């Protein structure tokens, strides 16, 4: 839905790296180099950044009135 604050395996913050990684990958750069120079070398964090859906962008339209 929204990117987790910390990697599930190791308590490393990956939430702040979502915007740069996503913006640069969408810009036309291979995810490997972007991840390597962003500061995530353990593949436990890479699977956190690589396999994310960002459902929260769609949900804000369908929000409970409450």
């Amino acid at each position: 839905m929204i990117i987790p604050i910390r990697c599930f395996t190791c308590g490393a913050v990956v939430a702040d790296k979502w915007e740069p990684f996503s913006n640069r990958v969408m810009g036309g750069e291979d995810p490997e180099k972007v991840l390597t120079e962003l500061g995530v070398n353990r593949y436990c964090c890479r699977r956190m950044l690589l396999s994310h859906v960002n459902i929260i962008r769609e949900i804000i339209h369908y929000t409970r009135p409450i």
Binding site: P4, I5, R6, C7, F8, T9, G11
Partner: protein
């Protein structure tokens, strides 16, 4: 299986379960007879204050 509890504490597989309770204020034959929705004071079958 064995699961890392630290991952669970970081929201690894936390979930939410939603249950719905719905009713209709049905009107049945009579003189203006309806099951009005209102908090209860002293009527029969009272559960407890």
């Amino acid at each position: 299986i064995i699961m890392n509890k630290s991952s669970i504490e970081r929201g690894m597989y936390r979930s939410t379960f939603f249950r719905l309770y719905s009713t209709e204020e049905v009107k049945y034959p009579g003189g203006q007879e309806d099951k009005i929705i209102t908090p209860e004071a002293g009527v029969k079958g009272y559960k407890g204050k």
